[model samples]
Target: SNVPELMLQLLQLEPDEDQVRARILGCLQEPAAFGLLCRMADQTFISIVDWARRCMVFKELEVADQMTLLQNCWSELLVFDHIYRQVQHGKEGSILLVTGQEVELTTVATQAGSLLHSLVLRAQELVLQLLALQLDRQEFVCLKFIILFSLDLKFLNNHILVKDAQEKANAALLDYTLCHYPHCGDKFQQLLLCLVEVRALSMQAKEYLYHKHLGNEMPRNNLLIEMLQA
Candidate 1:
C-alpha cells in the first residue's frame, strides 16, 4: 500500500486521538512518506511533532536516508570553505573537488591553526599557479577573495578580532594580486565584489545552521553547494 495514502486515511478519521496521531507519525518514519510528513507539518502542530520525531528516526531508516543526511552535512561543512578556496586557488580541480574530475592538488590551504606567514605563502603559491594557468586579473581576484573568506572559520577560532581579520584578509588578497597580476584598479574592484558575495553566502550558511538546530524543523528547499553554482 502507498504509505502517504495510508497515513492520510489514518489522519482523516473523525475525532482524531493520540493513537491515530501516533500511528500516522510512526508510518511517516518510512522514507517515501518523509516528504508527505513535511507537507502535513505545514497544516498542524501535531504534524510538526510528527516530522521532528521522524527526523530522529530518519537516521535509523534505510541506507538511502542516512546517505542523504551525510550529503547535507558535508555540503554545509564545505561549501563556503570551498568557495573561498576556489577563489584563492583558482578553480583548479587539483585544488577543489568537482565530481567527475581527477584530483591533483595536494594539501588544503585552510587547514587548522595555520599562521599568518603560512597563510600568505599558501595564498602566494595559489596566485602563482593561477597566473601560470593564464587566469586574468578578474578571475584571480575573485578566486583569492573566496579563499580568504573560506579561511574565516579558522581565523575566528584562533581569536583573531573580526576587524583585524578582515583587514589582514583583504591585505593578503591585494598583496597577492599586486605581486602577480597586471593592471590593478578594475580587477581589484571585481575581487571586492567576490568578497562581498562570499560574506553574504557565509552569513547565510551560519543562519542556516542556527535554524537547523534552533527551529526544530527539517531543512526546506536547500540546494547543495554544487547545485547552487549550477
Candidate 2:
C-alpha cells in the first residue's frame, strides 16, 4: 500500500525554514540566534498543524474537536514528526532544524544535561526502535491519528466520541500489523508503547524549549504562545 508514501508526500508540502546556521556566534549576538530559533520553531509547529489538517482525518472532526486534538496532541506530533524527519535525513547524534542545520544532541546535553539528558537518550532509543520496526506509511499515519484522538486527555467536550475514534484507529492499526507481521506477536503492543515514549519526549522537549529558548523573549506570534501554553 502506498498510503504512507501519499501521507509523506502531503507532509512534504509544508513550507521549509527560511534559513539554518550552525552553532557558533559571539555571546552578544546570542539573542539574534535565539530569535531566529523562535521563528523557526513557530513555523515548524504551524507546518505540523497544517499537515495534520491536510493529511489526516482531521477535517472530519468538529472544529472544537479539531482544536482539542491539536491542543492535546501537538507536542507529541511535533516530536514524532521531528524524529521521522531526522531519521529520513540520516541525522544521528544530532537534531535537525527545519532550516536544514544540524545541532548536535550532545550540545543540548552539555548545556542542559540536568533537564534534557534523559529526553535526548529516550529520543535516540525511540528513533532506533522506529528504524527496527520499519513502519510503513499506513501504520505511521494510523499511529499519528491514534495519538491525536487519544482518550487520555482531560476535560474534553466529546470524550466518548473521541475515544471511539481512537479505538477504531487502534483496531485498524492492530489488524494491519497482525495481517502483515503475524510472525511478530508483539508488534502492535510495541507500537502502542511507543506512544508513551512520544508523550514523554514531547513534554520534555516543550519544557526544555520553554525554559531554554523562550524564557525571556516575548513571542511575536500569539499562536505560538497559545501552543506553548497548551
Candidate 3:
C-alpha cells in the first residue's frame, strides 16, 4: 500500500529490542560504525538521485541544471531522510548516531552553540509534531520532490523552469492533503514550515560533521567525500 517506492528503501519492520540495543552500543566505537554509516549515506544519495532522474520533469532538465539541483538539495534531503527514518522507528527527542551513540537533542543543543543549537531544538520539535500528523507515502514523496525543485536554490540557470516544477509539486501536495485531511486546516502550511526548519538543521549538521573530522584532508569513504563536496 506504500505510495512511494523510495520510502520502502529506508523503512524497515521494527527490529528486535535486544538486537537494536546491541547494535546501538556497538556503533559507539568509531571503527565499528563508520563504514556502515557511509554505506547507508551512499545508498540514500544514490536512491535520491535515481528517483529524481526517473521523474519526467527532472529528466527533461539540462544535465548541468540537474547536477545543480542535486548538489543544492542533497544536504536538506539528507536531513529529511534522517528525521523520517527516526519518526518511522518511533525515536524522538534523541537520534541514534551511525556510531551507535544515542544522542539527545538537549545534548546537541548544548554543544552546537546558541544559534545552531536553537535551530536543532526547533527542528527536533517540528519532527516530533510531524510524526503525529501521520503523513502518507504520497505526501512524503511530494515533499521530497518539492525540496528537489526548490526555487530558493541560488545560481540555477533555469530558475523559471525549476520554479514552475516546484509550483506543480506544491499544488499536488496541497490537493492531496486537502482530499485526505480536509479537517486538518493548514496542514500544507505546517509542512512547508517544517521544511524551513529542516534546511536550518541541515546546515548545522554539515558543520557538526566538518568539525568532527577537522584536520582530516579527506574522509575515508568516497560517499562521504561526495556528500561533503555537495
Best by the TM-score measure: 2
User: How many steric overlaps does candidate 2 have?
Assistant: 1
TM-score of 1: 0.28
Candidate 2 clash pair list? 4-137
| Model 1 lDDT tens row, 1-230 | 12222223223322333554455445545433334534333233333224323432232344543344333333322333344345444544354322112234434344322332243344345444434445543333333323322433342333333344345545544555565555645444555654455445545554544444365445364323222331
Model 1: ten consecutive residues of lowest lDDT = 1-10
**How much RMSD separates candidate 1 from the native structure?**
22.6
- All candidates: TM-score: 0.28, 0.74, 0.70
lDDT ranking, best first: 2, 3, 1
CA shift of 107, model 2, Å:
4.0
User: In model 3, what is the error at residue 108, expressed in angstroms?
Assistant: 9.9
What is the clash count for each candidate, in the order shown? 6, 1, 1
Best by lDDT: 2
